[model samples]
Target: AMYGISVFLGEEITNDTIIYIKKMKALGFDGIFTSLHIPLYRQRLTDLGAIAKAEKMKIMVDISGEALKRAGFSFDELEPLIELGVTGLRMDYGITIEQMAHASHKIDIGLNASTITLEEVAELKAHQADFSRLEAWHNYYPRPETGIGTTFFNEKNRWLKELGLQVFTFVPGDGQTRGPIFAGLPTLEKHRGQNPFAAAVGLMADPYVDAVYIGDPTISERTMAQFGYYHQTNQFLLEVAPSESRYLKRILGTHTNRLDAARDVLRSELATIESEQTEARPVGTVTIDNEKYGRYMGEIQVTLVDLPKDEKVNTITRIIDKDQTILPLIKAGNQFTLVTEGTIENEFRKLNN
Candidate 1:
């Protein structure tokens, strides 16, 4: 539910840092989502986190540079930032799958999701991703003319929500070479706007995306204000544009429900709320707290939350089970608990509602 904007250091970053964050907040942006292309050059991870914390805004770190560069930093070295309290990550969907698995073994890590595809969006929704992002922009190096299709731009924007991806990044065509300067601008400017900036922003608010990522414009503050004004006032105009396909809706819906059920099960095993009523099963649990939360059985606590219905509940669901032996089960502390009772599915409405 947070909105973010991207900024670069070469354009007077530190001096303009506070101004940028303040402007974004006033413009209704949650915070900055830093894009680190060269880790050695931009180590603003800590500084940015400070600015965001000071401004009470949220920050999402896109370490795509690290992954894309294959920086050889064993996932262990990157642990500090996860604890720094950023939002989520952006990377190739395949690398995300691996990173999600790696973070599964750590604690206090930030939310992890990848730059997904239409297909991976479906998969992440199935697994109940923390959030999802789309790779709408990319430098298809050496192939200038091969990647300029705007037809899929609006479609991808509209369909992401159905896949449960709350976050989206706008990479509408080549902004530098593209026209209309502001293809995705929020203004109702005539000419359908049709420019690169407006096109990208327009596609971003395409009725489906909950949040968007856009580059800081090279235009003056006044122009940025104009962009902001349109983005705010006219965004609602596109809200009712249309929903995604029913097929995607149905599939994502089913998968989401299943994930909810599974989460409920994990909760039940941890709380021992009805331990007196249910049978105590092996229900493997690991306890390794030093890294992330702690290892339980062979599993670890990747993400933790405290839901009122499931009071004092520990949301430690399994992320990776190479052997597929870590079973999620419900158990009670006292013996004689019914086998069918105290399960997660039964507690779904309680925790969620």
Candidate 2:
């Protein structure tokens, strides 16, 4: 359940950037993913490393064999980088299994998930590579529509987990965008064009995923709150006002929609009183059927599209504000929790203090 965000370092660190790093630490981020290929001074690396150490955060550096060669260093030179406080190394390209196995003994090693195969894993095992400190991470797709499909990502991750290896995936950031591809860089095609927070929650729901990293540099406070909730409860938190929260208080677990193609329904586990047939059910309206009894007694639903009158259904409440972004990503079966108005306000205030 570890969570991390990408941090691109430059020649000099700014006060604002330092503050941002502290804020992320406060928000409970476990580590930062940075690059060794960038032109960073030794002093700068040491300074950043000190900050990371003080914050009890891990520093995973992304590097390549070509970058090491161009810098006039052998693969063994990575020991110095580890000495400088790099907790992990992500071999992005041009690194052999032998090199990765050699590096894994000193520091945590990450392999490219998109390119690495089960055969490669077997080869690494044959070479007796340490699996404990090794992990597989997927690349963030920069081009639009180039991301991997959800099904493929899921299957691939499951296979990796079955091999006793941890998996890391990416979600976009709502705040600062990554360069060369200013738009969101998601590892899954289904998450493309989706809200960064929603994309994150979607990935979090996957049992095979061990960690989720923000591909972009910065994340919004709202997004941070969601991550906080996930850390605390292992469930996606949807913050809604107190008045609206009562409607969801007793509801529990991941709910599924019965109607697959029904764009109007979001079924859940809650009760609603019966009412007269309405003219039309508007989008964003929550509803429950009057005739719902027995197993369906507490069955709840939210309409995402307008539909003509139905005698059995009654409106509950409407999702408002930024919370609206969560609806579309709910899918057929997803786990979620609602943060009551008081709870969310108190949580944010605690972070502020």
Candidate 3:
């Protein structure tokens, strides 16, 4: 599945925004998502288009009747925008079923995922909409509590998928969130204020979902690394705060959760560490079996539940709070790894380049 990053034209382009696009592109994003509204600034959109063109990234822009008029263009007269390297248009206000279906042959058209009906799909089909270019893009709810439910979303997405339409969804970014609500933008309620990579992984795993995009403006540095590293290798790259434990610093290689699986912890099958403080092991706590466990020495584990201190377990470091969602995903036989927060940027840089 493909991934994209959001960039709202409401804001001015800066080094930060440009850098954001480049960084995401560098991290394997091949598409850019944006919206066009009234009071359109040609220069900003032009600049975005140029960079997108230079980067060879797909640009999908939301458009409405007012947006078209403000931009001095109509639904069909999109050659100028197309020349500017705008590739997709998210169908919007006042654009009729005929116009949408007609335009799909010439350009990629995104139908509102939540609001589209089978009747509408039938209409499109009757109108002979270019099904290849018709995608169902879910809304990114910015409000605190208005996002959608998982089961319903899945059902709808599957219906669309079964109908041969690609489905897109959003995951909230962990940093540089959009304002007004200041709550992260997520298509699903479960994704709100959650790790973008984890939410993305969840969505991508859904057979019905075709793509996932960052609904917020930016993601945290470590989050970028997490996304990048996970794509580079299947292992989930979890971040940990700096720890004084030398053993914790040593736990920096790839690990596999044992196929046997643990009820309350992730057992490292790699046997790489061979060594932790036997402190109160809360969820996310990283520990290793010392020589005290005899043959089990060097076995690394991350607690999935709060547990009393153990005599043989050495607590090294803990996964950050944001990564708890990921802990549950590293089920039996899944690959996982630890990375100190300080090293995330450097590690990702090496791989991204």
Candidate 4:
């Protein structure tokens, strides 16, 4: 699985930690991301090593040559940590390019996505760095308004992809967020408070992103399940709430946005033949074409914008408005499923019609 969750270091491992690790495994997460600070406990690390090893998950921890020195390990000896289930080393800017190049040959290396310069890349190449085992990882901001803008993030990622390195970015967690500032850790400012699964799906839509990880310690179990379900089945799990209608059945199941996307709505490719409830269309309103639309009869549509009511198009149901944030990211050919609100108890699952 390309998805991962963060588990910050220094926190004492407990029964809760065991459950947290297992929860992620159950949710189909196969990797753990961590930021190293204090000297870590080997016993604690071994405990996690057992979980990671048993669950067949990988762990990538941010490492600094200086940090390693302080912790009594040198840059040459990461094998012990590797044997303890550490999959990759995210090297900080503390060491020389030569050290990094040397380490890349020995193990997986992660470079700073935002700050790596052309000189460093060239030096790395000159040093025969193993680019195949190298990746670019973006930073997550814990304070609101500090996350980088989308334009630069996209441009940098594009360049990284051109250099043959995969790009990984972080999405804010919906659980108890990280602090001194508990705002949430997100690589993109727009995703600061966005739904964790929605934020991750949006990131995956980008051409350059290779993987996504939650940047905080946990995601609500509900969101974890959504992430796991989405991982297993590449479909959006959206909640729909509205008055009864015959079209609910047709509107509720799996749907693929037609190959030719419209400017105003997501037209389902399943719309092969289809009633006329002419309610004005608002964003997230689910509707289908009626007899008046003739051959377009079975056409299923979800509004991407507000539109005047037309008797030819019948409003079937509405999506949870909280989920409306996910529509723009559901580009053409993407699949989605609508479930009647109440599949799970979520505060965001409210009646929108």
lDDT for position 352 in model 1: 30
Model 4: residues >4 Å from true position, as ranges?
244-250, 270-277, 344-353
Q: How well does candidate 1 score on lDDT at residue 7? A: 54
For all predicted structures, in order, the TM-scores are 0.44, 0.75, 0.90, 0.87
Clashing pairs in 3: 274-298, 275-298, 276-314, 276-315, 277-314, 277-315
lDDT of 1: 0.37
Ranked by lDDT, the better of candidates 1 and 4 is 4
Flag the better candidate by TM-score, 1 or 4. 4
Model 3 agreement with the true structure over 191-266: per-residue lDDT tens digits: 8888888999888888889999999999998889888888778779887877888686557667899999999999
Best-fitting candidate, measured by lDDT? 3
Candidate achieving the largest TM-score: 3
Model 1, 207: alpha-carbon shift in Å? 1.4
lDDT tens string, model 4, 18-90?
7887877776677888777754554566777778889898887786767667766567787887777877888
- Residue-level lDDT tens digits of model 1 in 246-286: 21111111111122334423322321111111112223221
RMSD of 1: 22.5
